[PDB]
């Protein structure tokens, strides 16, 4: 009860999973060399070619 940090394995697993998911969802906002990071603007501003 009094002493904490006795469950390092479970916390490490949970933190690894959450960090991986967060990095995946954050990678969605990159530009990847295009002219915009959102496709709705691209389809509403450019030509199909």
């Amino acid at each position: 009860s009094s002493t904490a940090s006795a469950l390092g394995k479970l916390q490490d697993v949970v933190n690894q999973n959450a960090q991986a998911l967060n990095t995946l969802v954050k990678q969605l906002s990159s530009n990847f060399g295009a002219i915009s990071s959102v496709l709705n603007d691209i389809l509403s501003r450019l030509d199909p070619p």
């Binding site: 002219i35 509403s44 501003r45 450019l46 030509d47």
Partner: protein, 49 residues
């Protein structure tokens, strides 16, 4: 109109214009526009000119 060495710059803002009325009349120069496609200029609401 001034020379190329003294090209005239001006600001256009706070108005409401249209481009199809100018686009359809094939009278002024020739249109080749990057970024926004010429035919889709009217529908979007960019800040100023």
């Amino acid at each position: 109109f001034a020379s190329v060495y003294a090209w005239n710059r001006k600001r256009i803002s706070n108005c409401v214009a249209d481009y199809s009325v100018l686009y359809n009349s094939a009278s002024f120069s020739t249109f080749k526009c990057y970024g926004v496609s010429p035919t889709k200029l009217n529908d979007l609401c960019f800040t100023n000119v």
